[PDB]
């Protein structure tokens, strides 16, 4: 039906909306690869704070990242959602391009 | 820095792809390519919103227009966002399919 179509779309730009975010794009990316700590993701992506923890803040509230502390350090991953499925899409198209052979 | 340039290039691509109505135009484009009237009946979208949020993913580069006899159809294009409107369609669109 046209309605649950409507339904559909408009969830998914919501999600692109909040996807729609240099920041959020290198970060989702980068935790493709695994779990990292605060400390590892501002090393890698080159972005420090207070932004770095405000977008991560972001993708935490979109369901899209949640935290792990198995002992002590707290590492940030991607959640098993239906969006995972979206990071790891705009991963094998765009983001793994970047990497060297 | 090539990563800040990818970075802010697809999220400029996903702010484009940001609204209900190109994403139902995107993902029926998927499927072929469909005159204005066709996708107004499919996706239920009349005047003036369904051919200005066209005009939009034109000027952006996503969809093109066809004409080789008469009838104006648009079509996806070959390029790189073609494959995001690709991964759009498998993991969202495509879910609305009846077996």
Redesign the interface.
């Known amino acids: 039906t ?1 309605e ?3 339904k ?3 969830e ?2 919501n999600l ?2 909040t ?8 970060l989702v990316c980068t935790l493709v690869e695994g779990e990292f700590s605060v400390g590892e993701l501002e090393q890698q ?2 972005i420090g704070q207070p932004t770095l923890s405000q977008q991560l803040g972001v993708l935490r509230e979109s369901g899209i990242v949640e935290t792990r502390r198995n002992i002590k350090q707290i590492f940030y991953r991607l959640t098993e959602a ?1 969006a995972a ?2 990071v790891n ?2 991963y094998t ?3 793994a ?2 990497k060297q052979a």
Do not use: T, W, Y
């Open positions: 046209r649950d179509m409507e559909r779309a408009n998914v730009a692109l909306k996807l729609s975010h240099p920041v959020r794009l290198m992506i080159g239906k499925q979206l899409a705009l198209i765009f983001c391009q970047e």
